[PDB]
Ligand binder design. Structure first.
Ligand code: SF4
Ligand code: SF4
Ligand code: F3S
Ligand SMILES: [Mg+2]
Lengths: 267, 534
């Protein structure tokens, strides 16, 4: 799978919906083919790898034990309840898999709010005791770079990897371990509707002429003011983002947002 | 020379989610099978007590491959519960984003999830690009030259001689494999198109964000309609239309010809992976409250009796737990559903999966493109009939060939082709409606204190239903019954094998260490375990 020349990436899937994986496939300039053939060596990835079963387990072992070293990218929360039983791969709990592999990585990136902070399955009452990577593995000294969002902007993953490869270090991180180059501003301070906000010009309903006219979505629940992300700047798929589609921000790059930001249509 | 004994495939890769497949092999053929889903999240438990308006944001996160589908199902479900009839334009926009989801999903499934079961990428290195170009140009109106395919070969050569095979590490085809049949040139064409599809899918997904804010995980639906006033503008409609047009060209000119070339080379695969019973919910409504207003209509078929399609009765669905890791053994209709995890480890108390086992009138039912296509055909759907018949004639096979792994794979292509065309029809109707001066996209509604609702989506993997019981204006019960739950859940309390389990019986396996034949059948159902278990 690996060796020298391209940096080895091991991509793990814990308790996840595969939306973070899909977001990376939307990579643009560079595209995912450039990333996989030229930039990186993608040495394990359950969604797209050819090997399955024992052959896939062997490819994972080969990648993790490489003298050349590897980068881990982790999608999904780690279920920790009932000794990790709620999530297994190859009959190993996800907690055990991550506890064994992540301390061997040269760097770990937690990709998506599930891997950074626990995510949707950690929402109350958290029946599987799902935890973010750094929370679950604090004891092992794992300190993943957290790229949050549900799913994050793939621009933020690629920018973080490129930085790491160039500088041999993590970029400046905020107090949630997210890179300040992407997460340093609220969604709200970047939003085109901020003049209506300042003017107290709020849509009272989605059917209203005020919503048609693009008035602020704060009264309809928008969490832009308490959410850190670069959505209005970079946008998604080179073309849009939630408020420009007329829907409030649901706070999806914040910890515990499923419980902190709900009801989503209230402020 | 043929293996007797167990084979375990864990993880099953090139699916969504965490699947363990177990088989018993006798004399080189599968005689028994178990479909074991090995992650649980419990979204139904998490939803209890919450605002019904919030359900679609949580359930969308059931799955990011079949992104949007669950937001759509939950929103249809809560729309239904509150009794709102959304405006025509909300129906059009929702329908258009769903049609775009199918095209993205099926193109990625064929190339990036399924094709490595059939395509030896490293043999593409020994192909003659000039011969390969001639073959590629014979099967498509798109002209491919020798230089075009050499560029691909040059790029692959450099990748392979680096020794870092990445996603091709330990592939079942490395060094050759008796169940891989393609010649080098066909491997090179398929590989070229795999790579091409990696960039094309970016545009197919972008089509959803034009109206739907972003992909993955759209953010434009609300109870009552949609939020995206910008979707009414000629600029956004034009942007959507251009992405759709390019995506449809790729379906017509690259995916379907490739599908046919591979199916022709693997015609033995009409002999494996058949199933008996089919269910489909219909999709792309004119009337949100009438399934029979959908472009594809609902139906149920037992024992391949397509001459006697039965009406779909939503009250005949029960989800079993006797072979699942939940409390007890009682099957439940989803408006009386229960999600009470109780793990017993693999085959502990004869339980082996986190999926429930949905049964329709007690029977295991395949859902997905092969159900939608066959039932639509049988209902006289003219577009489905014209495409299916032309595929059958190109392959030189009879309709019976459809009841197989190859047939299911072909049906996913037929449905992609048919939906790609129909998106243009919906788009034009949408445009026509705007031109009449209807600019309304959301309707007002009120939250009842007590209600029941159900939302039906025919997703790229089949019939999806979300079920809500509202109590004191909050979520009293919320149950998802997802297409992969139907197809890949375990046995029921009558011990009937699920569609995937049953389909696996009779599978030949040439090399037990590299059981690509099991992957071909399992991948032909396009499993989604995050969907199936939620
Ligand atoms: S962060 Fe969101 S999109 Fe990513 S795996 Fe979790 S639920 Fe899915
Ligand atoms: S729509 Fe949201 S992010 Fe934009 S100005 Fe209003 S509250 Fe802020
Ligand atoms: S919901 Fe998420 S994608 Fe951006 S606009 Fe809000 S942080
Ligand atoms: Mg369910």
């Amino acid at each position: 799978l690996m060796g020298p020349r391209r940096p080895s990436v091991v991509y793990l899937h814990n308790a996840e919906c595969t939306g973070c994986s899909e977001s990376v496939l939307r990579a643009f300039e560079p595209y995912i083919d450039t990333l996989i053939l030229d930039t990186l060596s993608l040495d394990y990835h359950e969604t797209i790898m050819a090997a399955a079963g024992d052959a896939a387990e062997a490819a994972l072992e080969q990648a993790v034990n490489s003298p050349h070293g590897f980068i881990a990218v982790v999608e999904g929360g780690i279920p920790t309840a009932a000794n990790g039983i709620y999530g297994k791969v190859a009959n190993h709990t996800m907690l055990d898999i991550c506890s064994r592999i992540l301390p061997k990585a040269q760097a770990v990136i937690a990709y998506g709010t599930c891997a950074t902070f626990g995510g949707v399955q950690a929402a109350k009452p958290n029946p599987t005791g799902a935890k973010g990577v750094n929370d679950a593995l604090k004891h092992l000294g794992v300190k993943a770079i957290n790229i949050a969002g549900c799913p994050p902007n793939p621009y933020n993953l690629v920018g973080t990897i490129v930085y790491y490869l160039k500088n041999k270090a993590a970029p400046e991180l905020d107090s949630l371990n997210r890179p300040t180059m992407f997460f340093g501003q609220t969604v709200h301070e970047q939003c085109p509707r901020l003049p209506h906000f300042d003017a107290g010009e709020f849509a009272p309903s989605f059917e209203s002429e005020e919503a048609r006219k693009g008035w602020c979505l704060y009264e309809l629940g928008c969490k832009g003011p308490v959410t850190m992300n670069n959505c209005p700047k970079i946008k998604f798929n080179q073309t849009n983002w939630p408020v420009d589609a007329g829907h409030p921000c649901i706070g999806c790059s914040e910890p515990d947002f499923w419980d902190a930001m709900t009801p989503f249509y209230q402020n | 020379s043929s293996y007797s004994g167990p084979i375990v495939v864990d993880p099953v890769t090139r699916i969504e989610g965490h699947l363990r497949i177990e088989v018993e092999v006798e004399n080189g053929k599968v005689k028994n099978a178990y479909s074991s889903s090995t992650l649980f999240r419990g979204l139904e438990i998490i939803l209890k007590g919450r605002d019904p308006r919030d359900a679609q944001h949580f359930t969308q996160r059931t799955c990011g491959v079949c992104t949007y589908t669950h937001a759509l199902a939950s929103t249809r479900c809560v729309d239904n519960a509150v009794g709102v009839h959304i405006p025509k334009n909300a129906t059009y926009i929702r329908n258009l984003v769903l049609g775009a989801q199918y095209l993205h999903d099926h193109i990625v499934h064929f190339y990036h999830l399924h094709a490595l079961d059939f395509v030896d990428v490293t043999a593409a290195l020994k192909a003659d690009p000039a011969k390969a170009a001639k073959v590629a140009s014979s099967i498509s109106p798109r002209k491919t030259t020798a230089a075009d395919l050499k560029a691909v070969q040059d790029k692959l050569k450099t990748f392979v001689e680096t020794g870092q095979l990445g996603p091709f590490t330990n592939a079942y085809f490395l060094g050759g494999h008796p169940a891989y049949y393609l010649d080098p040139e066909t491997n090179l064409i398929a590989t070229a198109h795999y790579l091409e599809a990696l960039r094309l899918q970016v545009k197919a997904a972008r089509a959803m964000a034009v109206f739907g804010a972003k992909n993955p995980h759209t953010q434009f639906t609300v109870v009552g309609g949609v939020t995206c006033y910008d979707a009414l503008t000629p600029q956004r409609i034009a942007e959507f239309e251009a992405l759709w047009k390019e995506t449809k060209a790729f379906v017509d000119e690259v995916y379907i010809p490739d599908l046919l070339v591979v199916a022709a080379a693997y015609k033995d695969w009409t002999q494996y992976g058949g199933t008996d019973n089919f269910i489909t919910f219909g999709e792309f409504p004119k009337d949100e409250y009438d399934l029979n207003s959908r472009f594809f209509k609902p139906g149920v078929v037992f024992k391949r009796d397509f001459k006697n399609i039965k009406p779909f009765d939503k009250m005949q669905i029960e989800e079993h737990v006797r072979h699942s890791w939940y409390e007890g053994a009682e099957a439940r209709h989803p408006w009386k559903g229960q999600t009470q995890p109780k793990y017993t480890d693999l085959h502990g108390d004869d339980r082996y999966s986190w999926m429930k086992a949905p049964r329709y009138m007690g029977e295991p039912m395949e859902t997905g493109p092969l159900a939608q296509v066959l039932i639509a055909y049988s209902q006289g759907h003219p577009k489905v009939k014209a495409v299916t018949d032309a595929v059958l004639a190109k392959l030189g096979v009879g309709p019976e060939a459809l009841f197989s792994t190859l047939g299911r794979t072909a049906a996913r292509g037929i449905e992609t082709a048919v939906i790609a065309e129909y998106v243009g029809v919906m788009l034009q109707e949408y445009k026509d409606n705007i031109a009449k001066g209807d600019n309304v996209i959301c309707a007002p509604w009120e939250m009842p204190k007590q209600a029941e609702g159900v939302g039906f989506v025919n997703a790229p993997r089949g019939g999806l239903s979300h079920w809500i019981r509202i109590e004191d204006g909050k979520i009293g019960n919320f149950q998802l019954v997802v297409p992969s739950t139907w197809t890949l859940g375990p046995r029921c309390d009558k011990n009937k094998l699920s569609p995937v389990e049953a389909s696996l019986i009779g599978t030949p396996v040439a090399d037990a260490k590299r059981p690509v034949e099991i992957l071909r059948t399992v991948h032909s159902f396009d499993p989604c375990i995050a969907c199936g278990v939620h």
